[PDB]
Paper text:
The Staphylococcus aureus inosine triphosphate pyrophos­phatase is a dimeric enzyme that hydrolyses noncanonical nucleoside triphosphates to prevent their incorporation into DNA and RNA. Proteins are biological entities that present various degrees of flexibility reflecting their molecular functions. They can adopt different conformations to perform catalysis, ligand binding and allostery.
We obtained a crystal form of this enzyme in which the asymmetric unit contained a dimer consisting of one monomer in an open state and the other in a closed conformation upon binding of a phosphate molecule at the active site of the protein. For instance, the E. coli liganded dimer structure could not be solved by molecular replacement using the apo RdgB structure and was solved using the SAD method. Because we usually assume that there is only one overall conformation in a crystal, it could have been useful to compute the self-rotation in order to evaluate to what extent the conformations of the two monomers were different, with the highest divergence producing pseudo-symmetry peaks with lower correlation. For this peculiar case, using data between 15 and 4 Å resolution, the self-rotation produced a pseudo-symmetry peak with a 37.5% correlation. The height of the correlations of the self-rotation peaks corresponding to the NCS provides a hint to the conformational variability of the monomers (the correlation values being inversely proportional to the amplitude of the conformational differences). The same case can arise for oligomeric structures following the sequential model of allosteric regulation, in which different monomers can adopt different conformations in the same crystal.
Numbering used by the authors:
A (entry chain B): 2 to 193
B (entry chain A): 2 to 195
The structure:
């Protein structure tokens, strides 16, 4: 009946209420207000697993965490697990965008991907990982006004648009996150 | 550990063997050499369901089937469900490619998408379907010689290669069929009691 989200994002949590409408969906802050997990991992997957396992082992409940980011091929994976605070600790997207555009710069191979890993851990269960991806190219500079993070510089060839130029619903169709959620839903459907 | 695949396409069976290395993959041609289901569906999903349900009823086993195709933007989704027999009923991959290329003679927006729908059917479950896709562009000619079907003209920008240029292992990491099967395998993992 209950499922907890290792996140402080009411957006994500409400999203999860639709995919767990059979469940009571609870934000982690309701159970561990001071939840704080040291992200000592190397990949999005390791960091997702640390978050969901810390909550699940302390709580004896089923919990979902995630971790997301941009990987740019020419920069050997950067910003990677450092996507949010790429250019500094006050996590300014524009600052992040400017550091990325400047480090890439003249480079012709601008191939990149967004990856979202969703982790699910619990007592009667081994921890499960669901990885979604969406591919594209780093643009010339910023283009578009919707979305956030690196969306203005992430060009999507199959749509001829940056992620920022897409509507929210358009983003919701093709995003790395939608891909990870599809994998989760298939698992959930699986247990019936 | 066995999976029966209700497909007559030997190329598909090969891909499936790459994607299920822990399974004994059994192609329908081993069990019913003249398997022949009338694909009267108007979508990939309908065609896949017809194949999986037909094999499952005749064998009283769980099986999977596959109906896949290529949708080219500039042709508003052609060849689509007609992908296999695009150029005629003899189902010549080479003829299908030539037709598609001719029809795109000068076109500059060559965006296309590979689509794969997997359906699972069995005597103890309602039929279930899973869809995978991969994006690319139609090249100006045939490059590479691995794979099958439209592989030699399906250029994958992510990889700077056509599907036919990729090793069987690499194709299996990124194909539309790999993506559909990931949803399937997640489904199977879900039925092992969470």
């Amino acid at each position: 009946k209950e499922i907890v989200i290792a996140s402080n994002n009411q957006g994500k949590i409400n999203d999860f209420k639709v995919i767990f409408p059979d469940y009571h969906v609870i934000g982690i802050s309701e159970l561990i207000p001071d939840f704080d997990v040291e992200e000592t991992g190397s990949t999005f997957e390791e960091n997702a697993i640390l978050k969901s396992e810390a909550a699940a082992k302390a709580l004896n409940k089923t919990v979902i965490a995630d971790d997301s980011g941009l990987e740019v091929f020419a920069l050997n994976g950067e910003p990677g697990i450092y996507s949010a605070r790429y250019a500094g600790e006050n996590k300014s997207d524009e600052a992040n965008i400017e550091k990325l555009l400047n480090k890439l710069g003249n480079t012709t191979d601008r191939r990149a991907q967004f990856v979202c890993v969703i982790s699910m851990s619990g007592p009667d269960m081994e921890t499960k990982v669901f990885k979604g991806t969406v591919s594209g190219e780093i643009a010339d500079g910023k283009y578009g006004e919707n979305g956030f993070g690196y969306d203005p510089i992430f060009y999507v060839p199959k749509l001829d648009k940056t992620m920022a130029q897409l509507s929210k619903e358009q983003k919701g169709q093709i995003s790395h996150r939608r891909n990870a959620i599809n994998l989760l839903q298939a698992f959930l459907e699986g247990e019936k």
